[PDB]
Each structure stands twice: as structure tokens, then as C-alpha cells.
Design a protein around this nucleic acid. Sequence first.
DNA 1: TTATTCGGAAATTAAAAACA
DNA 2: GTTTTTAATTTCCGAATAAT
Length: 59
Amino acid sequence: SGKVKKRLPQAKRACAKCQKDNKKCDDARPCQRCIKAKTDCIDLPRKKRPTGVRRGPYK
DNA sequence: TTATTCGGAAATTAAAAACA
DNA sequence: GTTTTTAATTTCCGAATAAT
Ligand SMILES: [Zn+2]
Ligand SMILES: [Zn+2]
């Protein structure tokens, strides 16, 4: 049988450069893509979705 | 050829809602 | 107080364009 492409598990979080490039980060810091690119590997904070927006009843 | 860009599918996730 | 629902948000696939 031929090989099926394993969708890799996602990184716990993506560093700023992997976020900008829309590419695969990892759980090392610096991440592997930043080591290869010789670029600063920085973690930036996530957006927190707001409180106080009703949804209406669930199915 | 490799490097960079990015649209959008798929995955994550957290407040609302539902439940105990 | 648990847990479930499901839309805000994030991750990165993959297919393009740009650079070399
Ligand atoms: Zn990264
Ligand atoms: Zn990085």
C-alpha cells in the first residue's frame, strides 16, 4: 500500500513568524522554522473572544 | 528550482447555554 | 457546581506567485 499523508498534530501554539507565514510551527523554542530562517522566535498573545454576546438557544 | 505569500479548510477553544 | 454547544479564533495545507 502507498503511504497516506499523516496530518501532523498541531503545535501547542505558533510563534509570530510561523503565524505571519501561515506555516507549521512546533513546540520547540526557538521553533525549527526560525532556526533554519535565522529569525527571532517570539510568542505573541492570542485574542480573547468577548463576553456578553448572546447566541440564542442551542439545538 | 526554491522562497514567499495567502485563501480558506480544518482544528482549537472558551462564553453561552444546558445540565446536575 | 458539573458539561455541552458551537462561533470566534488559530493553525497550517496546499496552491499560487515571486525570487533566484
Ligand atoms: Zn514557529
Ligand atoms: Zn519560531
